[PDB]
Design a binder for these strands. Structure first.
Lengths: 95, 84, 226, 109, 75, 134, 96, 104, 107, 82, 97, 226, 75
DNA sequence: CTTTATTCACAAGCTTGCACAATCCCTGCTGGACAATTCTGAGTGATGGCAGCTCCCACCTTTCCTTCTTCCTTCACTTAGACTACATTTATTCAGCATCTGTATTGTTGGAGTAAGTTCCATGTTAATACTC
DNA sequence: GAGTATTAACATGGAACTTACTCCAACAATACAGATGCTGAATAAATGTAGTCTAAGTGAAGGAAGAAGGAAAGGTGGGAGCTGCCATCACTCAGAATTGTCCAGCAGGGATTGTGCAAGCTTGTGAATAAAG
């Protein structure tokens, strides 16, 4: 019974996008799920602290961008910021 | 009842500690390394298991789950992937 | 800020060896790999290999296997290239460039290059040379033999100067490059567009792919103004 | 109504923007969420996952394997300085260690 | 209470006689099969001397090793 | 000392009667003006009910609530206080160490700027000098 | 007969155990040790299999990292044999 | 569904724990002062301990899928964060304070 | 209409109301029971009183009648439980514990 | 514009820091390594503080930004607010 | 003339700088170094004095802890003189390298 | 679980020196100070001193300075007490007890005690001798000279047995002690109350103050039932 | 039956030529990598001379040593 | 003593043969998307002023540089034993199967406890006031 | 009118009721998975020797670190001015939350399948011993 949600299908879709013929085991999927949850918790905690420091009650894309800059190393943070900015621009320009 | 567990740190044998040192790149191991390694392992295990049992007790459960061990490790700065 | 100091010109007799340094400054030395490129008039630009100072792991081109050896010295932040048995067909300009370990990153900062004088995927550029005045539009093509998922970069090289990065990841503008340049395309067809021309736009434009194990450069397109 | 295509397709992402927004709202991080924060966040997570998966797939192909196991993920993470710094205090289950023997330990000629 | 001291004392005497006479436990298990037609592994002899098996199985295996003990002291 | 205990006991039973009647302390302060023409504030009733004011103030405020208790058993508003604005407060506090005694000539000039009476400015500067003295 | 010199088989085991990823301690003794350690806090505790597996993985990872630090300490002192003082120095510098 | 002049706008004029720390110091050491730097250190300590215990209690409530942070969560967070005798005496003080509070 | 605020009710010097408001506005949980701020405030008061008494004893064994950051550093670093609780904390102007290695001493 | 300021962390200051740390004898090459280590630590902390300042849309680096950066590197500092 | 042997002046300096609590680096050179480092991240930046003081306190505490670890590493190698290899080993074990 | 093992009885001559260990197990040895007290029939219990093994920090009573020296061995988790120049008035029972570094904590666990025979605040217990039935109410008082802020503990000691902690902090029940015992008071007036007297309530009851530097015990009250 | 005589004569010729010029098996393996870009250990050379390798392996390594012999006869 | 050909043990590659686990498919079900409404949080500005810059000067404490003294670090050489390597014996572990039951999970109140709102009240500061000069 | 003290009104945050809701004990029922026990292969650990090679002790050289003394420089602290931005306050409007629907994306369970382990066979090599120079 019950129902537990995970990032398995999204990680599989990303894997098929970057490696169309490479598979992944269940243990590797669990490792990827733990990694995604850890990175989500880290970025969300940094964004929450940044919002609390500036007396704001809203977490925006600016807070997530600053948290990504704080938490990730150099080229990793730069490419992550580029991908996030591209996603936000395409989302706003959509509809 | 379930009997009682006594000693049990001698079950972490000398060849097991030797293999753990071999994975770490150790070429030569002194004869007194094994007792110190057993003490260090027991201290680390006690520190993790105390937090895991505290997490289990707060949940009003009698079974220590893998999630409790994961939170206990994560709170000690020893985050573990693959058991969430 | 970020710079790579190389050595001067070298005169070498056949059968000997030559070492060139790549002293890097302005960045964390261990977090970026050093790539080595050989440029000749006969075959243009060719990728030799790279060395990662973080773990000292190197990867050489198959045709350059054994011909060149890469070494790192983290104390001085230096990367040395050793060429043994200097063949007569080895006179060329050897550039050392910085590349992030990220797959999306490209060879961004290049050294001046050291000239040495001795006593796969095919990249096809459609316009070998084109004529344009000060204010037209310029388009170049970089058709790929195989499929590379957007792992294409564009470089502009003035005569007797190191190459300069313009577009990385086939669409993104490089650092310090104006928005007039624009990359487009993915898969096997890629295009580089210059909106309005300028007297500083007179140079040779190459396209490099780094989606596969051996990195291959384009044939080269020559651009002159007026 | 009309179709209701998902927010992830709107942002051109594979990761779930709606689930990320729901987790942000219920994670007790802030009173409000700004509706571009989940998109940014999902994009960053998808980029990190794609980079790690590409490195792990390359490591698997180097070992003549078509399936990624935790050893390939450990090899990808430990062989990248930025990724290793991001996951410095993280243990990967069944990932092993990087083969590294000190130069002094090797036999002398 | 009554039986456990008996099988413990018999196991101690068996191990002492085996160590004194020099036969190995694998040789004990093979000679049991040779004499009485029921070969038993070296793990069985180890568990017998180490009291690991159940009381019923230890009691069942006791007379075979008793016959081996009384035979071994003269041949 | 017996008068202090008597005042404490009396304030105790007026608090008990007021809680029994449901009237607030502000209700007592408002009804004091109806009873005597002497309206008192919430703070004055709180100070009296806590029994920490001056003995002379205690005796002065005593007979009014002696009559008020009998009024509540079966049965001109003052005063306006000048709450200075923050900008006006800054304009007034600009002259701490420059003009210790602005006097009437500066007071009349500054009072027209802030739209307040000259007496209010004089009282404020006198209170500021008294505070600086202590 | 044939004999390898001392250190050759040690280097071979170093190469072999750095290539594999499976656990190096037997499951049963570690489970008994975990049960005995947990019996000092609670009285009748049951353990999931995944809980003991995660505890074992964390323990082997910690011991391998501590042994790498101890090997660095031993090599720093112009030695190839790790001693208890190397482990103590590594745990002191780490903050344990 | 009504604002009624919006009284929520309160200004925190650099509020700290200095008055209560001074009260505790007078309780434990009646004749002893404390410098301004030491009081700032104690304010930082109190804020750090508040943040640590509150974060641990929030994580404890989130793990158990509860929406409320009660004294049980605070007690478990105190047991997790503080060392042995410190955690025991802190638990005793918290239990005594809660019992005194819910008795009048 | 009444009196006897929450700090007086719990027998505490620390502000129960301010701790309740900080818990409610800190984004820690959806709801806060009214035993959590009292427990918290009691724990914070206990830790404050413990370190304050240790620092006061350290000042008293210096012929000083005032606590400075050096006394707080001496009190914290001389207790292993307090040192473990604040092992990753730097006290400004607190100095270090006087400690010289036995090998460095001459003889 | 400032340049060549790591030499302002002089040799006697490094000897004083070593003496507070309990060091008895100091090698001659220790000073350059100490300057490099201090430069790396200062670069990391100042980059984090400048990121915190830039997020607030300020031009003045405050003590709060430095304290927040030191906390997020695990090096929590008392006596400077917060 | 009386000449102090080495190891006594060092012990006196150790006791003296361990008893005191004042900052050991001069304030003006550290402020210049802080501004020089920060100018590479943003231009026209300004610092409160408390921010520079906090940075100096953090840097001094970090250097003192690193020197304690370096002294432990040097004593482990049967030495009293700290060398750059001791600092490198102490930073490597701490996780900074 | 927590144990403090000691040695047997020492027989010694005047002018000699005696060293006795306090080998401890069952807890973190560096987290709890080891206190040493001496018991003689003439003046009851006396606080000798203590040693904290975490920093090896000792503190001795003023009247025991020089006569007693404390040392710690962290490797074996043991504490040694040395007495030099044993005079006639040293034949007594020496007890070593555990005590946390927290100011509120008291001596919770005591060793068996070694009998060594050679061949300020005053605590006042009012009832020196006392009688009670098997169900009566009883009370003892420990009025102090100076003001101690609830740093008072109540101990019970059977004959020829180490003292057992009953109350710490003047109101708190010790670990394992039933709720029958009740501590009360503060400041200078304290009291220990026993609800009903069992057969096990026949012992000597002592009160110890640890508010000031020299810890002083009470005179003691002997309670035998029926 | 037909091959093994031929490889025996070839091995005798190789051993005689190696002894005559004074070359060593290690030197033969090192030089072979220089000539043909594929170094082979001395174990393979000595096993080839001792005929212990299989027929397929001997046939595979025959032309390499055949080229080495004519290379060594002049240089 | 220097090298240089057997001998040996080991890992590494080539080639089938499955079997367990990964991939895929079906069915609900529930969580995310449409959409209009309501509710605030935060961007624009305007402002008053604090604090961060700049410059100047006088002092002297600190820093830098050179010389000589000391003693600490580094090689060199020995050797005693404590590690490693291996064959043999002994012992525990591992895997599958079986039983048993305390425990965890789901379900339906539903009463205690908490959020939101309004007003009432206690405290620090001070505008106003009585008394004197 | 100045100066003194005395009293009383205001700004502000906390507490007392008051009601609406929501949430998490509280039994009830039922899988089910963790524990215990057997039994036989499988793998490993323990013992006992042989023997190498490594850590440690001694000793000497040299060179590097430090102490001392003098010359110089620049850090420190105070005093001014100047203004840039920073924290506060007030407004509105654009974005974020609410709430009722429903539909289609996803999780659990069941079929399909194929990647990689395992077994063996062949092999090439590094380590280490016996021979030859």
């Amino acid at each position: 019974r019950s129902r537990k949600e995970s990032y398995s299908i999204y990680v599989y879709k990303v894997l098929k996008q970057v490696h169309p013929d490479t598979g992944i085991s269940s243990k590797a999927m669990g490792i990827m799920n733990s990694f995604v949850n850890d990175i989500f918790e880290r970025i969300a905690g940094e964004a929450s602290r940044l919002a609390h420091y500036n007396k704001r009650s809203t977490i925006t894309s600016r807070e997530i961008q600053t948290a990504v800059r704080l938490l990730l190393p150099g080229e990793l943070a730069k490419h992550a910021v580029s991908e996030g900015t591209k996603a936000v621009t395409k989302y706003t320009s959509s509809k | 009842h379930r009997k009682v567990l006594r000693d049990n740190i001698q079950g972490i044998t000398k060849p097991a500690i030797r293999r753990l040192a071999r994975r770490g790149g150790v070429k030569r191991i002194s004869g007194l390394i094994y007792e110190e390694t057993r003490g260090v392992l027991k201290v680390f295990l006690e520190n993790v298991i105390r937090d895991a049992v505290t997490y289990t007790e707060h949940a009003k459960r009698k079974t220590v789950t893998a999630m409790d061990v994961v939170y206990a490790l994560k709170r000690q700065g020893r985050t573990l992937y693959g058991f969430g | 800020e970020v710079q790579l100091q190389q050595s001067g010109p070298e005169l070498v007799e056949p059968g000997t060896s030559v070492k060139m340094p790549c002293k890097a400054s302005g960045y964390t030395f261990t977090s970026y790999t050093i790539q080595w490129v050989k440029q000749t008039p006969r075959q243009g630009l060719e990728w030799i290999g790279y060395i990662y100072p973080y773990n000292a792991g190197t990867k050489y081109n198959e045709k350059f296997k054994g011909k060149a050896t890469l070494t790192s010295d983290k104390s001085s932040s230096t990367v040395y290239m050793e060429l043994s048995s200097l063949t007569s067909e080895d006179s060329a300009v050897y550039y050392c460039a910085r590349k992030s370990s990220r797959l999306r990153s490209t060879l961004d900062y290049w050294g001046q290059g050291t000239s040495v004088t001795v006593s796969d995927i095919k990249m096809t550029q459609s316009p070998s040379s084109m004529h344009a005045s000060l204010g037209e539009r310029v388009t170049i093509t970089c058709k790929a033999s195989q499929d590379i998922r957007s792992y294409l970069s564009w470089y502009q090289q003035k005569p007797w100067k190191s190459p300069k990065t313009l577009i990385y990841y086939a669409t993104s503008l490089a650092d310090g490059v104006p928005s007039r340049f624009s990359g487009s395309g993915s898969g096997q067809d890629f295009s580089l567009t210059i909106n309005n021309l300028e007297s500083d736009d007179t140079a040779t434009y190459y396209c490099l792919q780094h989606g596969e194990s051996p990195y291959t450069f384009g044939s080269g397109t020559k651009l002159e103004i007026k | 109504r009309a179709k209701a295509k998902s927010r992830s397709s709107r942002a051109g992402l594979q990761f779930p923007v709606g689930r990320v927004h729901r987790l942000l709202r219920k994670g007790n991080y802030a009173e409000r969420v700004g509706a571009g924060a989940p998109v940014y966040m999902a994009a960053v997570l998808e980029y990190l996952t794609a980079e790690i998966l590409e490195l792990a797939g390359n490591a698997a192909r180097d070992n003549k394997k078509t399936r990624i196991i935790p050893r390939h993920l450990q090899l990808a993470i430990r062989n990248d300085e930025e990724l290793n710094k991001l996951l410095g205090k993280v243990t990967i289950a069944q990932g092993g260690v990087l083969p590294n023997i000190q130069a002094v330990l090797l036999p002398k000629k | 209470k009554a039986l456990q001291k008996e099988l413990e004392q018999f196991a101690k005497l068996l191990k002492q006689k085996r160590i004194t006479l020099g036969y190995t436990q694998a040789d004990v298990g093979l000679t049991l099969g040779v004499l009485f037609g029921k070969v038993f592994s070296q793990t069985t002899i180890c568990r017998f001397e180490a009291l690991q098996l159940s009381f019923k199985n230890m009691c069942k295996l006791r007379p075979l090793l008793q016959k081996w003990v009384e035979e071994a002291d003269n041949n | 000392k017996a008068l202090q205990k008597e005042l404490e006991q009396f304030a105790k039973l007026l608090k008990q009667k007021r809680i029994t009647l449901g009237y607030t302390q502000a209700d007592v302060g408002l009804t004091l003006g109806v009873l005597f023409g002497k309206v008192f504030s919430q703070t004055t009733i709180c100070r009296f009910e806590a029994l920490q004011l001056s003995f002379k103030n205690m005796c002065k405020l005593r007979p009014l609530l002696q009559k008020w208790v009998e009024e509540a058993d079966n049965n001109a508003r003052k005063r306006k206080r000048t709450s200075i604005e923050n900008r006006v407060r800054g304009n007034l506090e600009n002259l701490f160490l420059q003009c210790p005694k602005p006097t009437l000539q500066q007071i009349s000039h500054i009072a027209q700027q802030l739209g307040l009476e000259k007496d209010v400015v004089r009282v404020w500067f006198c209170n500021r000098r008294q505070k600086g003295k202590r | 007969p044939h004999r390898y010199r001392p250190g050759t088989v040690a280097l071979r085991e170093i190469r072999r155990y750095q290539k594999s990823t499976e656990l190096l301690i037997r499951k049963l003794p570690f489970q008994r040790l975990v049960r005995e350690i947990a019996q000092d806090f609670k009285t009748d505790l049951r353990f999931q299999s995944s809980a003991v597996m995660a505890l074992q993985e964390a323990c082997e990872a910690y011991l391998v990292g501590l042994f790498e630090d101890t090997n660095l300490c031993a090599i720093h002192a112009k030695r190839v044999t790790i001693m208890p003082k190397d482990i103590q120095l590594a745990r002191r510098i780490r903050g344990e």
